[PDB]
Amino acid sequence: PGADAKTVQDTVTQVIEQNMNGIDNLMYMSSNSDSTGTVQITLTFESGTDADIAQVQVQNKLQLAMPLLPQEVQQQGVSVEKSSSSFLMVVGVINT
Amino acid sequence: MPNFFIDRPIFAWVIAIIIMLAGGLAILKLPVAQYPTIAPPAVTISASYPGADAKTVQDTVTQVIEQNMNGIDNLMYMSSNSDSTGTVQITLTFESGTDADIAQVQVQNKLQLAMPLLPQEVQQQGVSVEKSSSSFLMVVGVINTDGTMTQEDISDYVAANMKDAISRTSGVGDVQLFGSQYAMRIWMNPNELNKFQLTPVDVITAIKAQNAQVAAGQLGGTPPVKGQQLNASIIAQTRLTSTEEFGKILLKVNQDGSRVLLRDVAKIELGGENYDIIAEFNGQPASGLGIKLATGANALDTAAAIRAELAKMEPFFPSGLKIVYPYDTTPFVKISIHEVVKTLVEAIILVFLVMYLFLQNFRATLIPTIAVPVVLLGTFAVLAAFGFSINTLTMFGMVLAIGLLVDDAIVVVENVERVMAEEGLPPKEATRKSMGQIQGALVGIAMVLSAVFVPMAFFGGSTGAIYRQFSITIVSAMALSVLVALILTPALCATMLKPIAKGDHGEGKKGFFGWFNRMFEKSTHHYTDSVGGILRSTGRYLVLYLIIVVGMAYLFVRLPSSFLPDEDQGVFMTMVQLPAGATQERTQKVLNEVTHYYLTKEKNNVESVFAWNGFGFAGRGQNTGIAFVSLKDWADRPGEENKVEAITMRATRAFSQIKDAMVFAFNLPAIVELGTATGFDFELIDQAGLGHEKLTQARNQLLAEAAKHPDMLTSVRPNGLEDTPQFKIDIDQEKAQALGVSINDINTTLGAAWGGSYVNDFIDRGRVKKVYVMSEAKYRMLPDDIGDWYVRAADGQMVPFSAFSSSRWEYGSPRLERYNGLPSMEILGQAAPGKSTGEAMELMEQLASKLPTGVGYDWTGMSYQERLSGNQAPSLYAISLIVVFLCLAALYESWSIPFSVMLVVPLGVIGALLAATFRGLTNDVYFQVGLLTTIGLSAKNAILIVEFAKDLMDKEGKGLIEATLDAVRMRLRPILMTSLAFILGVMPLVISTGAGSGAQNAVGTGVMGGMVTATVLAIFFVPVFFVVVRRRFSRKNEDIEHS
Amino acid sequence: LGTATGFDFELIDQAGLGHEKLTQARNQLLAEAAKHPDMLTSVRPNGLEDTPQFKIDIDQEKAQALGVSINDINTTLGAAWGGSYVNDFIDRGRVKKVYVMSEAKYRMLPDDIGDWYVRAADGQMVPFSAFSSSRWEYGSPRLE
Amino acid sequence: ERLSGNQAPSLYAISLIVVFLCLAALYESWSIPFSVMLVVPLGVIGAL
Amino acid sequence: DLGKKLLEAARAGRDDEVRILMANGADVNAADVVGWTPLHLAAYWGHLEIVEVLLKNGADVNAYDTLGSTPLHLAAHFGHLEIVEVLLKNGADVNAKDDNGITPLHLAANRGHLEIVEVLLKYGADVNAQDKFGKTAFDISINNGNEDLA
């Protein structure tokens, strides 16, 4: 929160990325760090890779690096999700 | 099924081509590697505590992690070591077959729950959890030939520009960097610190404040005010980037107004994260990458891709940056492929020869030339379907199967040639009759051979993983061979063989061949006359058989047994250990001498020396190191004297004269990931409230008592390190309290100065790296330097360390060992000349039982496999005997006639035992699998002999003796043809010298001798076997003919 | 999947270059590609262009002279202009976060920087203007 | 794309060979299969 | 040559090999990088007989390391009563001070050896000697709560 793209990339993004080795069937990795204090790091695996195996190896590697992130980033909760699934539906909520 | 394909020879051709298509396809896409997964799955937890000692590491890190290592499946045992370099490694080894990814995840999940309990210094260094039982694919070295870089400069270029695109390459998994990336090194000066009234605490606080990155919000930030027009990121502070910016850190504005800058109390330079390892390649500074193969990955394609991507970086290298390759398994693998293929292609040639010698037409020589490769190719497709790879064990399992696949082709063609000759039938009608004579036996042979080779695949541990590679490879090729013998080869016999006139045995041919046919006709007559003679007095030869059996027993009990032959791998190891307390500069001169030796006295042989100063294979410390010797190509080291074994002896001998050190060289085991093989691996455990001192005691007790049985144990010794003198320094809590000097100010001053302190991160050329404060070397070497450090009291006075502290000398461990959570010392050692390791252990157990109460023990590593796997071979092969008998009982429809086939077993076994004892080889896995292939081929010969005789009495009414001599007459030529080609085909293997010849000698010798006696003896003995068995179990009218 | 049409290209800094030397070589590649409209069309970036950002510098000498600590400065600036997660409260039985942040009107324009004070060790309120300077510069709002 | 262009030719060269071999088995001839495989472009041109 | 083979022979407690090395003219008073003599080793580890074979062979009984500690310091610190006696009977300085001013009485009084304290006291151990912090053997005892030593 409140961080800029450079601060996000250089206290969070690079720290996580340097710990993304020893992971099986990894095709490529890409990330963006922006001025909203938000960083997203996507790891894409070969077709046929067990998605649950991939996520667990990512989470296991991302974890070893959690003690090195700023407390403000840890307190916000670093999420690790399967992101290549498509959308089933979008629900909107309004008050008339 | 044959008849269907005699009538449709293009259908049978199409199935063979499709089988060849799948096989050649599988070859292109199958993983290739030196060995499959043999070592049991192991997971290693690594953690680092900078500046900490072995005791501090073990008691704030190791024990904390170990107590949380429960609730984990298939765990075999756990061991760890904590040493004075602030390094801890905890290895968990699981049962063979455990999913390595499942094991690592359960380890990581358990290690994690304990992370909040580790010191922040250990957490900040990163606790790694890796699969560590994989072997090395290659070792890359990096040097600068312009001489313009220290190893830290190289190590940083490797990390920043090389290591990650290497971890991205096709097929690689797990890469280890030699050294570290750059660390911002703040080298403190204690005199200048005291003169400005500053401590390391004020330095660290200044770096943590002025080398920081600040989240500062946004102008126009959300939620904004109505009508806001500007939105912009507010950039407040950024990480520093250079030695100069760190230099002008404002520590203190003095009373007069002068500024205390950081460069006014410290030297500042990019350096290494750590300085415990000196790495030298041919005496020059170096960094590199240790690269491992990912599970089930193609080693050939991974190394080739790696060498291509370094070639995609070399233009962008700084000048003089040179890539080098001290280790790479790829060439030794390619030589193995080449040798096995050469053995196969020239075994095909020897069959074309022996085919043309006995059958004398280029038409019958083609059939086995087609069938054998069809089976060979197709076996690869079967291996793909079951998940196997192309490795040393599978490739050698295919050459050990050559004799069986060849016999299937010979027996089918030779029988059609004989039926045509003895009856004048046309090829199509003779092929039909010949297949009716053997197809039931071929099927029954497939079941018997299954029962011989399949039980192998159910041994446990690393050795069961080895046998299973041969077991599945040989059964698959065998099953395919029979299928081909029932589909393709009868179709080929009916369509390609030309008719032979009835009674024509070629005795009227001219020249060499006509002379040959007449002589073999004479020899057959002598054979049957002989066998007629032996059959008249069978009790004499039943005694000869008993002597061959008792002798085979004596030769078996007398022959030593081993694991896998040592191979000249083109590299080997030499280890260096100095006495305790020896420094880094002392070990370097030794390594420089070990280095200098190799590049002069072994100039022709050695290509390079990769020396490491800091870690050995007994532990880590300044008094230890190793040198990796990469030889020149095997081609340029001809002769015994230029092999690794000879080069390692001349090394160790000339390192006897080295006084300041203790240096040996040795070869690598065939399976490096396993190591060991020889000797035992023992653990002495503290199980009550004893200590490291009472444990080292009982160890020396056990070591001395074992040294008093040199008839039994030899070279028993520790695996770890001996206690070394350490500087115990005590803080007086009363004085430090009196002088107003805080304990926290004391401990971080001492630790950060003498051990170093990770402070925070800076940013070097866009890449985040660490910042380390540590005293300049000269002010942190000797105990007198302790006094030159001052700490600020609450009032403001500088108080020297001497004013609140005392110190003495004491002894302590620089490397503590724990086994399964309790203190331990590992004790290696082996069995005496001519003694079994199984009985060497029983003495070690007896000696350890007389040790003090509370001291226990346990077996580990290779030894742990033995203690729980000795009961296996008898039962497993008792199951093999029973199924073989039952299958023969089904084939022959009799409970007794099977005995006539099973008695051929020792006939080939004695030949293997003789050829092995002659050549001075060992009972090893290659010898045992060759035993089975020899036993299987002899059983195939006996089965077909017995089936021909029994069918003559059954379907043609002849009596015992006429059928016996008749069957053994028809079977003489096929039995001799196969053995002549096989014995000749295993020829280059028995005499093999050079790379891979360890395994080649192993599969060659035993098979060779086993082949010779099996055929010499069985041609005479199984005619005896059938007759004596058919006489004991009989009821009425069997020596006389009947309608 | 998205995509389907066209290509997807990445320009990478592989030596010690920077975001500035990289955006340069990108515009080089983008302009040269725009000079082959027979071949490539609509080549462009996927990300964001550099935007003006407010670089504000803390004078370590003055803040040290006025007895105002750096830690007091940075958490005052960050929590006011960026916001700060502090701890958790409990809203109708459900645990939720607590955020401190300046009211909007006092954190919009650079002139608002002066209206924030920090306590020295002696007890005096020192305005931000007394230990800080600032300029305009360009920076990336989304680094790739 | 960059790692999957070599695929379609080999994959359908394998398809041709197995089709021929199967027809060679059905007809018991190495030549008569050719009479069947030549129909391939007849429908392809209509789709194109 | 043999001054090194003796330190390790005296650290290991190998009697005959010490006796053989004394016969080989090995220096009784050889010292390693921290100043520990074969008597230092034999006193630290508790080998009486090698203390007796070295002293019988002219071993310096009052050798001090690079921090000032003596074989009596080690033997009195670590409870080897018989070696504390054998050192003292052969002229061991009972009041020797290391670079911190610690006497064998200070050491034996810290860990709670009641016998070694008495044997030192008989052989004229200064009850009131002080370390660099002014502490005596009595101050140690009331610190440890050892009512017997007090």
Side-chain angles (χ1 to χ4, degrees), chain B residues 284-306:
Chain B
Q284 328 166 48
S287 182
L289 302 186
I291 306 177
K292 303 207 157 183
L293 199 45
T295 61
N298 191 314
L300 291 194
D301 193 77
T302 304
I306 280 165

PDB file of all heavy atoms in Angstrom, chain B residues 284-306:
ATOM      1  N   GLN B 284      43.874 -20.838 -11.027  1.00  0.00           N
ATOM      2  CA  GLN B 284      43.335 -19.510 -11.272  1.00  0.00           C
ATOM      3  C   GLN B 284      41.987 -19.342 -10.576  1.00  0.00           C
ATOM      4  O   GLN B 284      41.255 -20.318 -10.390  1.00  0.00           O
ATOM      5  CB  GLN B 284      43.158 -19.250 -12.774  1.00  0.00           C
ATOM      6  CG  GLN B 284      44.180 -19.937 -13.659  1.00  0.00           C
ATOM      7  CD  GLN B 284      43.771 -19.933 -15.117  1.00  0.00           C
ATOM      8  OE1 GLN B 284      43.372 -18.902 -15.659  1.00  0.00           O
ATOM      9  NE2 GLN B 284      43.865 -21.090 -15.763  1.00  0.00           N
ATOM     10  N   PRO B 285      41.627 -18.119 -10.181  1.00  0.00           N
ATOM     11  CA  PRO B 285      40.322 -17.908  -9.542  1.00  0.00           C
ATOM     12  C   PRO B 285      39.188 -18.282 -10.483  1.00  0.00           C
ATOM     13  O   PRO B 285      39.273 -18.084 -11.697  1.00  0.00           O
ATOM     14  CB  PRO B 285      40.316 -16.409  -9.218  1.00  0.00           C
ATOM     15  CG  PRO B 285      41.743 -15.973  -9.313  1.00  0.00           C
ATOM     16  CD  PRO B 285      42.386 -16.865 -10.320  1.00  0.00           C
ATOM     17  N   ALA B 286      38.119 -18.833  -9.914  1.00  0.00           N
ATOM     18  CA  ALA B 286      37.037 -19.331 -10.746  1.00  0.00           C
ATOM     19  C   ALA B 286      35.734 -19.355  -9.962  1.00  0.00           C
ATOM     20  O   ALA B 286      35.727 -19.483  -8.735  1.00  0.00           O
ATOM     21  CB  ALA B 286      37.348 -20.732 -11.284  1.00  0.00           C
ATOM     22  N   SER B 287      34.637 -19.213 -10.698  1.00  0.00           N
ATOM     23  CA  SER B 287      33.299 -19.536 -10.236  1.00  0.00           C
ATOM     24  C   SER B 287      32.690 -20.504 -11.237  1.00  0.00           C
ATOM     25  O   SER B 287      33.231 -20.724 -12.323  1.00  0.00           O
ATOM     26  CB  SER B 287      32.427 -18.285 -10.091  1.00  0.00           C
ATOM     27  OG  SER B 287      31.141 -18.612  -9.590  1.00  0.00           O
ATOM     28  N   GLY B 288      31.560 -21.093 -10.876  1.00  0.00           N
ATOM     29  CA  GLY B 288      30.957 -22.042 -11.787  1.00  0.00           C
ATOM     30  C   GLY B 288      29.570 -22.450 -11.352  1.00  0.00           C
ATOM     31  O   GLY B 288      28.986 -21.874 -10.431  1.00  0.00           O
ATOM     32  N   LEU B 289      29.051 -23.461 -12.044  1.00  0.00           N
ATOM     33  CA  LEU B 289      27.718 -23.996 -11.802  1.00  0.00           C
ATOM     34  C   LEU B 289      27.790 -25.510 -11.698  1.00  0.00           C
ATOM     35  O   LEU B 289      28.336 -26.171 -12.588  1.00  0.00           O
ATOM     36  CB  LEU B 289      26.746 -23.600 -12.922  1.00  0.00           C
ATOM     37  CG  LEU B 289      26.539 -22.114 -13.206  1.00  0.00           C
ATOM     38  CD1 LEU B 289      25.439 -21.918 -14.235  1.00  0.00           C
ATOM     39  CD2 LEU B 289      26.188 -21.397 -11.919  1.00  0.00           C
ATOM     40  N   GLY B 290      27.249 -26.051 -10.611  1.00  0.00           N
ATOM     41  CA  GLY B 290      27.001 -27.475 -10.521  1.00  0.00           C
ATOM     42  C   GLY B 290      25.593 -27.770 -10.994  1.00  0.00           C
ATOM     43  O   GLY B 290      24.625 -27.293 -10.396  1.00  0.00           O
ATOM     44  N   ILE B 291      25.461 -28.543 -12.068  1.00  0.00           N
ATOM     45  CA  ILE B 291      24.191 -28.722 -12.760  1.00  0.00           C
ATOM     46  C   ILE B 291      23.750 -30.173 -12.635  1.00  0.00           C
ATOM     47  O   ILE B 291      24.553 -31.096 -12.814  1.00  0.00           O
ATOM     48  CB  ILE B 291      24.300 -28.301 -14.239  1.00  0.00           C
ATOM     49  CG1 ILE B 291      24.833 -26.870 -14.338  1.00  0.00           C
ATOM     50  CG2 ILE B 291      22.956 -28.419 -14.931  1.00  0.00           C
ATOM     51  CD1 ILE B 291      25.049 -26.392 -15.754  1.00  0.00           C
ATOM     52  N   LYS B 292      22.469 -30.370 -12.332  1.00  0.00           N
ATOM     53  CA  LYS B 292      21.896 -31.692 -12.142  1.00  0.00           C
ATOM     54  C   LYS B 292      20.824 -31.955 -13.189  1.00  0.00           C
ATOM     55  O   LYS B 292      20.191 -31.028 -13.703  1.00  0.00           O
ATOM     56  CB  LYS B 292      21.292 -31.840 -10.741  1.00  0.00           C
ATOM     57  CG  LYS B 292      22.270 -31.565  -9.618  1.00  0.00           C
ATOM     58  CD  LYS B 292      21.891 -32.324  -8.361  1.00  0.00           C
ATOM     59  CE  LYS B 292      23.091 -32.508  -7.450  1.00  0.00           C
ATOM     60  NZ  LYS B 292      22.756 -33.317  -6.246  1.00  0.00           N
ATOM     61  N   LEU B 293      20.628 -33.231 -13.500  1.00  0.00           N
ATOM     62  CA  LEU B 293      19.556 -33.637 -14.395  1.00  0.00           C
ATOM     63  C   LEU B 293      18.232 -33.648 -13.643  1.00  0.00           C
ATOM     64  O   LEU B 293      18.150 -34.154 -12.520  1.00  0.00           O
ATOM     65  CB  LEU B 293      19.833 -35.021 -14.976  1.00  0.00           C
ATOM     66  CG  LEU B 293      19.046 -35.372 -16.240  1.00  0.00           C
ATOM     67  CD1 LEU B 293      19.058 -34.215 -17.230  1.00  0.00           C
ATOM     68  CD2 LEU B 293      19.583 -36.644 -16.875  1.00  0.00           C
ATOM     69  N   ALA B 294      17.200 -33.085 -14.261  1.00  0.00           N
ATOM     70  CA  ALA B 294      15.857 -33.244 -13.730  1.00  0.00           C
ATOM     71  C   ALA B 294      15.395 -34.680 -13.935  1.00  0.00           C
ATOM     72  O   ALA B 294      15.813 -35.359 -14.878  1.00  0.00           O
ATOM     73  CB  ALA B 294      14.891 -32.270 -14.403  1.00  0.00           C
ATOM     74  N   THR B 295      14.539 -35.146 -13.027  1.00  0.00           N
ATOM     75  CA  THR B 295      14.039 -36.513 -13.089  1.00  0.00           C
ATOM     76  C   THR B 295      13.418 -36.803 -14.449  1.00  0.00           C
ATOM     77  O   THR B 295      12.635 -36.006 -14.972  1.00  0.00           O
ATOM     78  CB  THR B 295      13.007 -36.742 -11.984  1.00  0.00           C
ATOM     79  OG1 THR B 295      11.902 -35.847 -12.172  1.00  0.00           O
ATOM     80  CG2 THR B 295      13.626 -36.498 -10.616  1.00  0.00           C
ATOM     81  N   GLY B 296      13.787 -37.946 -15.024  1.00  0.00           N
ATOM     82  CA  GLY B 296      13.226 -38.364 -16.298  1.00  0.00           C
ATOM     83  C   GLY B 296      13.475 -37.407 -17.440  1.00  0.00           C
ATOM     84  O   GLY B 296      12.621 -37.271 -18.323  1.00  0.00           O
ATOM     85  N   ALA B 297      14.622 -36.734 -17.450  1.00  0.00           N
ATOM     86  CA  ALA B 297      14.980 -35.809 -18.514  1.00  0.00           C
ATOM     87  C   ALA B 297      16.110 -36.387 -19.353  1.00  0.00           C
ATOM     88  O   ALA B 297      16.915 -37.192 -18.874  1.00  0.00           O
ATOM     89  CB  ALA B 297      15.392 -34.447 -17.950  1.00  0.00           C
ATOM     90  N   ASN B 298      16.163 -35.967 -20.614  1.00  0.00           N
ATOM     91  CA  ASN B 298      17.175 -36.445 -21.551  1.00  0.00           C
ATOM     92  C   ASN B 298      18.500 -35.758 -21.241  1.00  0.00           C
ATOM     93  O   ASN B 298      18.637 -34.545 -21.426  1.00  0.00           O
ATOM     94  CB  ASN B 298      16.732 -36.175 -22.987  1.00  0.00           C
ATOM     95  CG  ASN B 298      17.598 -36.882 -24.013  1.00  0.00           C
ATOM     96  OD1 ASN B 298      18.826 -36.857 -23.937  1.00  0.00           O
ATOM     97  ND2 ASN B 298      16.956 -37.520 -24.985  1.00  0.00           N
ATOM     98  N   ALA B 299      19.482 -36.534 -20.773  1.00  0.00           N
ATOM     99  CA  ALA B 299      20.790 -35.965 -20.459  1.00  0.00           C
ATOM    100  C   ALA B 299      21.494 -35.467 -21.715  1.00  0.00           C
ATOM    101  O   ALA B 299      22.144 -34.415 -21.692  1.00  0.00           O
ATOM    102  CB  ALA B 299      21.658 -36.995 -19.737  1.00  0.00           C
ATOM    103  N   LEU B 300      21.385 -36.213 -22.817  1.00  0.00           N
ATOM    104  CA  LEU B 300      22.023 -35.801 -24.063  1.00  0.00           C
ATOM    105  C   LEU B 300      21.482 -34.458 -24.538  1.00  0.00           C
ATOM    106  O   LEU B 300      22.246 -33.565 -24.922  1.00  0.00           O
ATOM    107  CB  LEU B 300      21.816 -36.871 -25.136  1.00  0.00           C
ATOM    108  CG  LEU B 300      22.542 -38.206 -24.970  1.00  0.00           C
ATOM    109  CD1 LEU B 300      22.499 -38.997 -26.268  1.00  0.00           C
ATOM    110  CD2 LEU B 300      23.977 -37.987 -24.519  1.00  0.00           C
ATOM    111  N   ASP B 301      20.158 -34.297 -24.514  1.00  0.00           N
ATOM    112  CA  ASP B 301      19.548 -33.068 -25.003  1.00  0.00           C
ATOM    113  C   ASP B 301      19.704 -31.913 -24.023  1.00  0.00           C
ATOM    114  O   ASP B 301      19.688 -30.748 -24.437  1.00  0.00           O
ATOM    115  CB  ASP B 301      18.066 -33.300 -25.304  1.00  0.00           C
ATOM    116  CG  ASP B 301      17.448 -32.169 -26.100  1.00  0.00           C
ATOM    117  OD1 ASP B 301      17.689 -32.097 -27.324  1.00  0.00           O
ATOM    118  OD2 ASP B 301      16.721 -31.350 -25.499  1.00  0.00           O
ATOM    119  N   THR B 302      19.852 -32.205 -22.729  1.00  0.00           N
ATOM    120  CA  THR B 302      20.004 -31.134 -21.752  1.00  0.00           C
ATOM    121  C   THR B 302      21.404 -30.532 -21.794  1.00  0.00           C
ATOM    122  O   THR B 302      21.557 -29.305 -21.769  1.00  0.00           O
ATOM    123  CB  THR B 302      19.691 -31.647 -20.347  1.00  0.00           C
ATOM    124  OG1 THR B 302      18.380 -32.225 -20.332  1.00  0.00           O
ATOM    125  CG2 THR B 302      19.744 -30.506 -19.345  1.00  0.00           C
ATOM    126  N   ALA B 303      22.434 -31.377 -21.866  1.00  0.00           N
ATOM    127  CA  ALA B 303      23.800 -30.873 -21.950  1.00  0.00           C
ATOM    128  C   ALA B 303      24.031 -30.134 -23.262  1.00  0.00           C
ATOM    129  O   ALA B 303      24.615 -29.044 -23.277  1.00  0.00           O
ATOM    130  CB  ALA B 303      24.794 -32.022 -21.796  1.00  0.00           C
ATOM    131  N   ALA B 304      23.575 -30.714 -24.376  1.00  0.00           N
ATOM    132  CA  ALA B 304      23.753 -30.072 -25.675  1.00  0.00           C
ATOM    133  C   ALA B 304      23.076 -28.709 -25.715  1.00  0.00           C
ATOM    134  O   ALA B 304      23.621 -27.753 -26.279  1.00  0.00           O
ATOM    135  CB  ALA B 304      23.211 -30.972 -26.785  1.00  0.00           C
ATOM    136  N   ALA B 305      21.888 -28.599 -25.119  1.00  0.00           N
ATOM    137  CA  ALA B 305      21.213 -27.308 -25.069  1.00  0.00           C
ATOM    138  C   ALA B 305      21.960 -26.333 -24.167  1.00  0.00           C
ATOM    139  O   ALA B 305      22.097 -25.152 -24.505  1.00  0.00           O
ATOM    140  CB  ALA B 305      19.770 -27.487 -24.601  1.00  0.00           C
ATOM    141  N   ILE B 306      22.461 -26.810 -23.023  1.00  0.00           N
ATOM    142  CA  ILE B 306      23.221 -25.950 -22.115  1.00  0.00           C
ATOM    143  C   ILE B 306      24.424 -25.353 -22.834  1.00  0.00           C
ATOM    144  O   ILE B 306      24.656 -24.138 -22.794  1.00  0.00           O
ATOM    145  CB  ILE B 306      23.651 -26.735 -20.862  1.00  0.00           C
ATOM    146  CG1 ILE B 306      22.497 -26.846 -19.867  1.00  0.00           C
ATOM    147  CG2 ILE B 306      24.856 -26.074 -20.202  1.00  0.00           C
ATOM    148  CD1 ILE B 306      22.729 -27.884 -18.788  1.00  0.00           C
TER     149      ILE B 306
END
